[PDB]
Amino acid sequence: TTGIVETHFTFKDLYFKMFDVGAQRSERKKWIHCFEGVTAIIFCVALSDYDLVLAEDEEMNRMHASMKLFDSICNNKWFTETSIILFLNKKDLFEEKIKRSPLTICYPEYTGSNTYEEAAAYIQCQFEDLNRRKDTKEIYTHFTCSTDTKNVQFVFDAVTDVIIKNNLKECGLY
Amino acid sequence: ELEQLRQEAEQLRNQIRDARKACGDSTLTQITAGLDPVGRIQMRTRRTLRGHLAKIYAMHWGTDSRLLVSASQDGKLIIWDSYTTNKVHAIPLRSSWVMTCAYAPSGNFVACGGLDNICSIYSLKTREGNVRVSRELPGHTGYLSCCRFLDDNQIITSSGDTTCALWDIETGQQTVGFAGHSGDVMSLSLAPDGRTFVSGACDASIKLWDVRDSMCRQTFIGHESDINAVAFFPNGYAFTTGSDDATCRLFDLRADQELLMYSHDNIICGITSVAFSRSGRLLLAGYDDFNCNIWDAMKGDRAGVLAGHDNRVSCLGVTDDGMAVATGSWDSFLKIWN
Amino acid sequence: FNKIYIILFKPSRNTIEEVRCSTAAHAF
Amino acid sequence: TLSAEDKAAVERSKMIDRNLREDGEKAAKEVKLLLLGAGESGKNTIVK
Amino acid sequence: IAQARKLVEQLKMEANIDRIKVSKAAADLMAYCEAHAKEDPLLTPVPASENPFRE
């Protein structure tokens, strides 16, 4: 059935629990305060979606919608001290499609070449600059893929950093 | 002839509005001006209930006016004997994202729901000792906001999929399905006779339904924001509503319009819950500013404050004998004022 | 004294971001 | 001073509270992460 | 378009609701409040001897 999906896994003696709420097709301003006390918010953004367009509007890049959703959930009144772990996915499809089409299709003021690195850093910067609260929260960004287990390692390290910094703030030492 | 249908609907709305205007010959405050004020009302925290380790989102008294149930985001459903503060049961839950609970009018069952879009029925009396699940009610595609019992075999639920529903507990299929709102239905209030019920939604409107027909009978507007809670007047022909515009409003069924608004200039936060007293004179409403204000329902002047919660006053309930009030907050503490 | 040297002269190191970046560099 | 049923209720309440304490202590030790994105956002792949 | 027809029919049904003037409804509410006032402890604090939540 639909609803929130709950996932458990143990990694280096830590029991990670994750809650997928993509099945919730309703107003998010009525249940998002339930997740007020979460260690981190893992946000997935597909890099290969700059060329694509959402069929609902036919003039709406899915990357712009991802940016809107990320900004909405980042600067929420409840997540004022919660860290966000960004996952820029499908780096390979981006690698070929940037060779085919420039990133100017999505952002009209890109002003750059068609190499993977410039566009990747550009999308990362455009996402991270949407963090208006640059004092009490941090964004950790990855590029995933690699068909490996480095993703859980990155999540573990980022969660450990979040926990340590939370303790430091609670002590006043940060 | 779609435009003809639009014109016909506009004509119907215009004539309904004309009837509503013609009904108005006075105001509730004008008639009640002669009545004597309640004066200051002061209640003290007699019993404080502890044990929840997260925000309490719901509660519901029992018909015996002694036992109540509390639901919290720690994933428990605790049943309290308020007289002695002794806990009776603590039901573990499949999911922790609970947003509502209810107590069967006989005392034999409880219900809970939340972000799993499932209503779950728990039988308090068991030959197995544990309060194990007696019934699951899938079918909603949104978070389940409220739920109430008609009898041991009938339950009404509302949800974020913009529809309410009646259920056959033994069958497990919905008998009657109420659609017609345009936003997430957030609360409902069953009448004492059990034949009708009102339900307010994020569409800034309330609708009155009869549970035999799945056909809306009346629709009330007037609020500017989401309807967070509704309570139904003891007489049976009126009901109050709280909302995010920091106001409560009293609607009368037999006049099909408002009768009074309860607000003040020094209040800006929204209302989380409203409830009436036994006679109906008192309107107790809980706010986001950690306070439960009491209004003279017949005049609109504030008559007291219940303070002592450190966080949002989520839920509010008055006993059937009308002797005490119970408040539950995000600070994980239930209190009993009396 | 060293810390004083940081606070008055070279005051561009008096940032929350640098401190959090180093504490991340601890075990990340 | 107290009835036998009253003592039984008291010890039942104490057992319930002790179990609640154990469950809270257990629930304290895990990390809760909120996963967000879109269907075609690599969300399923990152869960993988 | 069928939704429009259903909406029109529902509005027709709601139009024919028999209504009353504000005066009678207000009188009924006030009469109920006055009639059931003595059995409302939250208004009339009952003595400690009749209070089962006494401290």
Tokens of C16: 């929350």
| Helices within chain B (DSSP H only) | 2-23, 28-32
In the DSSP assignment, the letter for residue A32 is G
- Say how far apart CA A127 and CA A86 lie, in whole Å: 9
**How many Cα atoms are found within 13 Å in the side-chain-facing hemisphere of E39?**
10
Provide the token pair at A115: 């190499």
Distance (Å, rounded) from C-alpha B37 to C-alpha B296? 8
* Contact in structure between B206 and B257 (CB atoms under 8 Å): no
Distance from CA of B280 to the nearest CA of E (A): 6
Q: Which residue of B has its CA nearest to A24?
A: B142
Q: Which residue of C has its CA nearest to A169?
A: C20
List, in order, residues 6 or more apart from A57 with CB less than 8 Å away.
Answer: none
* Residues A29 and B244: beta-carbon distance below 8 Å: no
**Is the dihedral angle over the CA atoms E30, E34, E36, E37 positive or is it negative?**
positive
Q: Give the residue from B109, B106, B114 showing the smallest Cα distance to B146.
A: B114
| Contact status of A63 with chain D (Cβ, < 8 Å) | no
Tokens describing residue B91:
């039901």
- Chain E residues within 8 A of B82 when measuring between CB atoms: 53
Which of these, B151, B167, B170, lies nearest to B159 by C-alpha position?
Answer: B167
B120 — phi, psi (to 5°)? -125, 135
Residue B297 contacts E where some CB pair is shorter than 8 Å: yes
B partners (3+ CB pairs within 8 A) are: A, D, E
Nearest to B46 among E7, E21, E53 (CB): E53
- Residue B85 touches chain E, beta carbons under 8 Å: no
Query: Among partner residues A14, A38, A144, which is closest to D46 by beta-carbon distance?
Result: A144
- State how far the alpha carbon of B172 is from the alpha carbons of A4, B101, B154, B176, in Å: 22, 19, 10, 12
Question: Which phi and psi angles does A79 have, rounded to 5°?
Answer: -95, 55
Q: Which two tokens stand for residue E48?
A: 């400690």
Contact B272, B286 (CB under 8 A): yes
**Cβ A4–B73 below 8 Å, yes or no?**
no
Chain B stretch 193-222, residues whose beta carbon is closer than 8 A to a beta carbon of chain A:
202
Residue among B279, B257, B275, B250 nearest B327 (CA): B275
DSSP-derived secondary structure for chain D: ---HHHHHHHHHHHHHHHHHHHHHHHHHTEEEEEEE--TTTTHHHHH-
Specify the residue for token string 């008639």. Answer: B31
Secondary structure class of B186 (helix, strand, coil): strand
Q: Do A22 and D39 touch (CB under 8 A)?
A: yes
Show the tokens assigned to D47. 């869960």
Angstrom distance (rounded) from CA B101 to CA B114: 9
Question: Hey, are the CB atoms on A1 and B202 less than 8 Å from each other?
Answer: no
Task: Answer positive or negative: Cα dihedral of B309, B313, B319, B323.
Answer: positive
Chain E residue with the nearest C-alpha to that of B219 = E14
CB contact, 8 Å: D2 with chain A? no
Candidates E2, E5, E17; CA nearest to B217 is E17
The count of other CB atoms within 10 Å of the CB of residue B187 is 22
Determine contact, residues B230/B189, Cβ cutoff 8 Å: yes
Backbone Cα Rg of chain E: 22
Strand A139-142 and strand A83-89: the pairing is: parallel
CA distance E4 to chain B (A): 7
Q: What is the rounded CA–CA span in Å between residue A90 and residue A93?
A: 6
Closest chain A residue to the Cα of C26, Cα to Cα: A161
Q: How far apart are CA B17 and CA B14, in angstroms?
A: 5
How far B99 CA sits from the closest chain E CA (Å)?
28
| Measured distance CA(A18)–CA(D34) in Å, rounded | 6
- Residue from A83, A78, A75 nearest A162 by CA: A83
DSSP run (H or E) holding B242: strand B238-243
Q: Which of B135, B137, B73 is nearest to A19 (CA)?
A: B73
Angle between helices A116-128 and A91-100 (to 10 degrees): 120
- Please report the resolution in angstroms: 3.8
Structure method = cryo-EM
Is E9 part of the contact surface with chain B (CB cutoff 8 Å)?
no
Domain E1-53 has CATH 3.40.50.300: no
